[PDB]
């Protein structure tokens, strides 16, 4: 729900609440946008977790 | 230097700045009645659905009466005779609209 | 579900770079700003100028401070603030429209 | 304008012009989705800039650039399936 | 009233919007399947029209677009959603301006 500035304004930290499962660094996750649905599947973006 | 009035610095001019206020500034129906007719026919349709609800209530009363007779499910009172009395009400409202047009 | 905020933006300010040679950094700056402020609504008009929507004047002040200093260290020309309008109808349609 | 041009062109070819309520992260333009029919697995995502329709390869990241597409390319890819 | 209360199609623009898409097609319409076919993409046209106002490029508030009459004779082949959305947007604009 939030993005936070690093000490230098270069990258953002995503503030997330893990509702289920487990997460490890380097994991492959799929990011869903605000209007991702069965109609709009193009809001998906594959990303790693640094 | 204040509200767009004044010079940036008094140095360089023969003055001291000191801007003053001017002290003399002058501060000074609907044409296509077809819409109403369509609304009238639509409220007639709302009354039609209301009487269909009343007919459904009468059908429930008939089902209860038939169940009581059996003692001595859900059924329908009138499948199609309601359409004839509906056409009668259509004639009635057409007479109403004719009378209203004559009155105007 | 997307967040249901407690207020709308209804406070518009138009910005542009001081010199158009540094237009791309402002665009990246606006992107970063849009990331960091949830009710900020960065929009681009037909004229090419960029508008920003914020909750109030303090909101826009902090937003423009971050835009100038934090994200895109350039200098920008900020227009006077203006409200966000809406249109409505007060009387029934005069004629049928097809 | 060109927007009405593409609108009536999609109207002629019996397609569906759906506005995706999104804006491009880099250019800020509105994104649109054109579907051939109720079959939604095949759908073209396109944005409009300087009177040329811009397309993205399926499965590509956002930072990847947008390649051009034409009316005849759209019809060729929509008539063979 | 009853039929008007049952005829609420959608809110525009999007959910939580302050516009109501209503339809008063006089009933007596055999083409109910046709009407329900064209409704699913007249909804999108109504949302598009009420999101981007004709008076200025802005949202519309506190207005119901009660549909009056729709006429379409041929079969479903000629009913293209993209062919009819601009018509819905334009008629919404024109009705709003006349109001």
Curated annotation (Swiss-Prot), chain A:
The chain holds residues 493 to 542 of 984 of the full protein. Belongs to the 40S cdc5-associated complex (or cwf complex), a spliceosome sub-complex reminiscent of a late-stage spliceosome composed of the U2, U5 and U6 snRNAs and at least brr2, cdc5, cwf2/prp3, cwf3/syf1, cwf4/syf3, cwf5/ecm2, spp42/cwf6, cwf7/spf27, cwf8, cwf9, cwf10, cwf11, cwf12, prp45/cwf13, cwf14, cwf15, cwf16, cwf17, cwf18, cwf19, cwf20, cwf21, cwf22, cwf23, cwf24, cwf25, cwf26, cyp7/cwf27, cwf28, cwf29/ist3, lea1, msl1, prp5/cwf1, prp10, prp12/sap130, prp17, prp22, sap61, sap62, sap114, sap145, slu7, smb1, smd1, smd3, smf1, smg1 and syf2. The gene is cwf10. Belongs to the TRAFAC class translation factor GTPase superfamily. Classic translation factor GTPase family. EF-G/EF-2 subfamily. This is Pre-mRNA-splicing factor cwf10. It is found in: Cytoplasm; Nucleus. Component of the U5 snRNP complex required for pre-mRNA splicing. Binds GTP.
UniProtKB/Swiss-Prot annotation, chain B:
The keyword Hydrolase does not apply. One of its GO terms (biological process) is mRNA cis splicing, via spliceosome. The keyword rRNA-binding does not apply. GO terms for cellular component: cytoplasm; nucleus; Prp19 complex; U2-type spliceosomal complex. Keywords: Cytoplasm, mRNA processing, mRNA splicing, Nucleus, Phosphoprotein, Spliceosome. Residues 60-72 have a biased composition (Polar residues). It is found in: Cytoplasm; Nucleus. Residues 35-72 form the CWF21 domain. Involved in pre-mRNA splicing. May function at or prior to the first catalytic step of splicing at the catalytic center of the spliceosome. May do so by stabilizing the catalytic center or the position of the RNA substrate. Belongs to the CWC21 family. Belongs to the 40S cdc5-associated complex (or cwf complex), a spliceosome sub-complex reminiscent of a late-stage spliceosome composed of the U2, U5 and U6 snRNAs and at least brr2, cdc5, cwf2/prp3, cwf3/syf1, cwf4/syf3, cwf5/ecm2, spp42/cwf6, cwf7/spf27, cwf8, cwf9, cwf10, cwf11, cwf12, prp45/cwf13, cwf14, cwf15, cwf16, cwf17, cwf18, cwf19, cwf20, cwf21, cwf22, cwf23, cwf24, cwf25, cwf26, cyp7/cwf27, cwf28, cwf29/ist3, lea1, msl1, prp5/cwf1, prp10, prp12/sap130, prp17, prp22, sap61, sap62, sap114, sap145, slu7, smb1, smd1, smd3, smf1, smg1 and syf2. This is Pre-mRNA-splicing factor cwf21. It comes from Schizosaccharomyces pombe (strain 972 / ATCC 24843) (Fission yeast). The gene is cwf21.
Curated annotation (Swiss-Prot), chain C:
Component of the U5 snRNP complex required for pre-mRNA splicing. Binds GTP. It comes from Schizosaccharomyces pombe (strain 972 / ATCC 24843) (Fission yeast). It is found in: Cytoplasm; Nucleus. Belongs to the 40S cdc5-associated complex (or cwf complex), a spliceosome sub-complex reminiscent of a late-stage spliceosome composed of the U2, U5 and U6 snRNAs and at least brr2, cdc5, cwf2/prp3, cwf3/syf1, cwf4/syf3, cwf5/ecm2, spp42/cwf6, cwf7/spf27, cwf8, cwf9, cwf10, cwf11, cwf12, prp45/cwf13, cwf14, cwf15, cwf16, cwf17, cwf18, cwf19, cwf20, cwf21, cwf22, cwf23, cwf24, cwf25, cwf26, cyp7/cwf27, cwf28, cwf29/ist3, lea1, msl1, prp5/cwf1, prp10, prp12/sap130, prp17, prp22, sap61, sap62, sap114, sap145, slu7, smb1, smd1, smd3, smf1, smg1 and syf2. This is Pre-mRNA-splicing factor cwf10. Belongs to the TRAFAC class translation factor GTPase superfamily. Classic translation factor GTPase family. EF-G/EF-2 subfamily. It comes from the Eukaryota.
Curated annotation (Swiss-Prot), chain D:
It is found in: Cytoplasm, Cytoskeleton, Microtubule organizing center, Spindle pole body. This is G-patch domain-containing protein C1486.03. It comes from Schizosaccharomyces pombe (strain 972 / ATCC 24843) (Fission yeast). Belongs to the TFP11/STIP family. It comes from the Eukaryota.
